[PDB]
C-alpha cells in the first residue's frame, strides 16, 4: 500500500513554533517533490511549502520567512520547521507527493492530516 504518514501538530500560543514530519512508503517519493498542504475549515486545500529530490526549496508567500522546509532523502521524510506562528496558522497540515507528473492536486497522495492550532 502506498502510505504518507504525518506527525507534530498540536496547539501552541502565537509566535511560537512547531515541527511536523512525514514518512512516505519506500518507493512514492524518491526522485520525487515533496511537500506541504494545508487546510482550515470551509476554505479549500492550499499550498505551504515544497522540496525537490535535488533540494530546492520554495513556499506560499504567506509563510516565506518563517516556515522552513526540509527532507531526508534516505529516509523518505520530509520536515516542516514552522516558527513565528500566528493565528491565521491554524489549519489541518498534510505533507503531500504527486502520484501523477503534472502538479495537479486531483493526483496527490495525501497524510491523513495533523491539527495546528495558534492561539492569540
Known amino acids: 500500500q502506498v502510505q504518507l504518514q504525518e506527525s507534530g501538530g498540536g496547539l501552541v500560543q502565537a509566535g511560537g513554533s512547531l515541527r511536523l514530519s512525514c514518512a512516505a512508503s519506500?518507493?512514492?517519493?524518491?526522485?520525487?517533490?515533496m511537500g506541504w498542504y494545508r487546510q482550515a475549515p470551509g476554505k479549500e486545500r492550499s499550498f505551504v511549502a515544497a522540496?525537490?529530490?535535488?533540494?530546492?526549496?520554495y513556499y506560499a508567500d504567506s509563510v516565506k520567512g518563517r516556515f522552513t522546509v526540509s527532507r531526508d532523502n534516505a529516509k523518505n521524510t520530509v520536515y516542516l520547521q514552522m516558527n513565528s506562528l500566528k493565528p491565521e496558522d491554524t489549519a489541518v497540515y498534510y505533507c503531500?507527493?504527486?502520484?501523477?507528473?503534472?502538479?495537479?492536486?486531483?493526483?496527490?497522495?495525501w497524510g491523513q492530516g495533523t491539527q495546528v492550532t495558534v492561539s492569540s
Open positions: 519506500p518507493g512514492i517519493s524518491r526522485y520525487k517533490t
Open positions: 503531500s507527493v504527486d502520484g501523477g507528473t503534472r502538479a495537479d492536486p486531483y493526483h496527490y497522495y
Open positions: 522540496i525537490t529530490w535535488g533540494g530546492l526549496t
